[PDB]
Write an enzyme that holds these catalytic residues in place. Structure first.
Site, PDB file in Angstrom:
ATOM      1  N   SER A   1      72.687 -38.043 -45.254  1.00  0.00           N
ATOM      2  CA  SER A   1      73.607 -38.129 -44.111  1.00  0.00           C
ATOM      3  C   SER A   1      74.493 -36.888 -44.106  1.00  0.00           C
ATOM      4  O   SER A   1      73.968 -35.769 -44.165  1.00  0.00           O
ATOM      5  CB  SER A   1      74.333 -39.469 -44.180  1.00  0.00           C
ATOM      6  OG  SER A   1      74.980 -39.788 -42.956  1.00  0.00           O
TER       7      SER A   1
ATOM      8  N   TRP B   1      70.835 -42.809 -34.218  1.00  0.00           N
ATOM      9  CA  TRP B   1      71.975 -41.903 -34.140  1.00  0.00           C
ATOM     10  C   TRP B   1      71.647 -40.552 -34.769  1.00  0.00           C
ATOM     11  O   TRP B   1      72.129 -39.525 -34.287  1.00  0.00           O
ATOM     12  CB  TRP B   1      73.137 -42.571 -34.861  1.00  0.00           C
ATOM     13  CG  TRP B   1      74.503 -41.995 -34.664  1.00  0.00           C
ATOM     14  CD1 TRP B   1      75.300 -41.448 -35.630  1.00  0.00           C
ATOM     15  CD2 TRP B   1      75.227 -41.887 -33.436  1.00  0.00           C
ATOM     16  NE1 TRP B   1      76.493 -41.045 -35.082  1.00  0.00           N
ATOM     17  CE2 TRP B   1      76.474 -41.320 -33.734  1.00  0.00           C
ATOM     18  CE3 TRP B   1      74.958 -42.266 -32.121  1.00  0.00           C
ATOM     19  CZ2 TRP B   1      77.432 -41.077 -32.754  1.00  0.00           C
ATOM     20  CZ3 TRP B   1      75.918 -42.015 -31.155  1.00  0.00           C
ATOM     21  CH2 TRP B   1      77.131 -41.432 -31.485  1.00  0.00           C
TER      22      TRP B   1
ATOM     23  N   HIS C   1      69.879 -46.493 -41.428  1.00  0.00           N
ATOM     24  CA  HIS C   1      70.438 -45.329 -42.130  1.00  0.00           C
ATOM     25  C   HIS C   1      70.785 -45.695 -43.565  1.00  0.00           C
ATOM     26  O   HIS C   1      71.493 -46.670 -43.825  1.00  0.00           O
ATOM     27  CB  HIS C   1      71.696 -44.885 -41.364  1.00  0.00           C
ATOM     28  CG  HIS C   1      72.229 -43.523 -41.714  1.00  0.00           C
ATOM     29  ND1 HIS C   1      71.525 -42.365 -41.479  1.00  0.00           N
ATOM     30  CD2 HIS C   1      73.433 -43.136 -42.192  1.00  0.00           C
ATOM     31  CE1 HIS C   1      72.252 -41.321 -41.837  1.00  0.00           C
ATOM     32  NE2 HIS C   1      73.424 -41.761 -42.262  1.00  0.00           N
TER      33      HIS C   1
HETATM   34 MG   LIG Z   1      71.456 -35.767 -31.809  1.00  0.00          MG
END
Ligand SMILES: [Mg+2]
Length: 398
Positions: free
Chosen positions: A233, A324, A374
């Site tokens: 991330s 996302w 995620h």
């Molecule tokens: Mg993007």
């Protein structure tokens, strides 16, 4: 419409590895520094000091030697520093061989990567999202709170050391964190307001990874020419920028780094430049805000950041539900970087669309997408360990 990594700023095509390495790479590094991450004001600072503060030869029931190291960024004891945790597989040490290393930052403190009660509790500020914190400070209940992202025993059993530093040692992850950070010291400006091209958290985190490598070059237990830098991330955005800027890193892993990491910004999918800069105004250069709702004006895109790792092995991975981060944009960045890897005789994913889940694709430039949200999971790590076995620099050329 993506800028071509193999077309120089002046429009001349890059046909060979020397023009790539000595002309095009500096051009791209400067574009990312100026327009995206901010300028890294220097690399290794003078007077780095390495202090081994604890050393355990029988950690994890005998499986590892565990070292904690204060890496201080100047000789004055008042200088800023970071706290590095290292587990080294004892099977490797016992054979009088140096271990290769996985190196990455952690989100919530060294004590969260493993339950091991002997890890020093971070004394630094930690975010509210950190599990089992109290008033932004580590607690005993936070030990091993992030262990799922850190399969230390398996990494060691596969012959690799594990090195980590809390990202907040370098810049606390809060919108005002830069004023406490390494950047408040290195940038070394007298005035208050950071300059338009000044680095932010991602640059400072990436710099810390290179300072951890400087330490590893001095540690007789590890082979600092075989260091895989990885991140999840936001810390994978840092891992990419570290691996792009510092070609000492032997292998680079981006686990779901998304916007401003591996994902193409010009896709406008999931998180966007405006969204990331508005929520995390400290992460990038102020200059990156020029591209809020204006990604079409970006002079680079993230495929060129991936290209800056070539010819070294690069792994980009996604999560199936992680819209996302824009998994397709992460994959398409890999495909658009592939021509640079191919210039160096390497191979990337075959396929024009995202592969099916849990089916990695590619040679030294590799991609997978796994089921779920995620995160960074044991399945991600299984694939990374296989990649490192195959593509990480060997212990020989004898
Ligand atoms: Mg993007």
């Amino acid at each position: 419409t993506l800028p071509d990594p193999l077309v120089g700023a002046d429009g001349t095509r890059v046909h060979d590895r020397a023009t790539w390495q000595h002309r095009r790479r500096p051009e791209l590094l400067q574009l990312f520094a100026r327009e995206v991450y901010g300028r890294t004001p220097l690399g290794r600072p003078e007077g780095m000091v390495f202090k081994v503060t604890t050393m355990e030869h029988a950690a994890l029931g005998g499986a590892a030697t565990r070292k904690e190291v204060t890496v201080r960024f100047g000789r004055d004891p008042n200088a800023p520093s970071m706290q590095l945790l290292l587990y080294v597989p004892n099977a490797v040490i016992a054979r009088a061989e140096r271990a290769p290393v996985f190196l990455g930052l952690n989100f919530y403190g060294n004590h969260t990567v493993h339950t091991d009660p002997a890890i020093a509790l971070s004394a630094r500020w930690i975010p509210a999202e950190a599990p089992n914190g109290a008033n932004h400070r580590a607690t005993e209940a936070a030990r091993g709170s992030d262990a799922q992202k850190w399969p230390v025993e398996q990494i060691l059993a596969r012959g690799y050391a594990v090195a980590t530093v809390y990202c907040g040692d370098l810049c606390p992850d809060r919108p005002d964190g830069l004023n406490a950070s390494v950047a408040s010291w290195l940038d070394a400006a007298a005035g208050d307001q950071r300059a338009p091209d000044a680095w932010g958290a991602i640059g400072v985190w990436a710099w810390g990874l290179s300072r951890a490598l400087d330490y590893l070059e001095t540690d007789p237990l590890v082979d600092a020419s075989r260091v895989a830098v990885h991140g999840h991330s936001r810390l994978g955005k840092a891992a990419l920028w570290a691996g792009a800027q510092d070609d000492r890193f032997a292998l680079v892993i981006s686990n779901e780094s998304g916007c401003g990491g591996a994902a193409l910004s010009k896709r406008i999918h999931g998180e966007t430049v405006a969204r990331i800069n508005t929520v995390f105004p400290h992460w990038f250069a102020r200059n990156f805000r020029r591209y809020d709702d204006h990604e079409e004006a970006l002079p680079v895109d993230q495929h060129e950041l991936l290209a800056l790792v070539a010819p070294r092995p690069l792994y980009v991975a996604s999560a199936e539900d992680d819209d996302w981060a824009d998994p397709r944009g992460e994959f398409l960045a890999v495909k658009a970087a592939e021509p640079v890897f191919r210039l160096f005789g390497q191979t990337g994913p075959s396929g024009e669309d995202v592969p099916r889940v849990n089916e990695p694709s590619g040679g030294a430039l590799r991609y997978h997408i796994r089921p779920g949200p995620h995160g960074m999971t044991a399945q991600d790590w299984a694939f990374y360990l296989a990649f490192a076995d195959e593509w990480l620099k060997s212990a020989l050329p004898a």
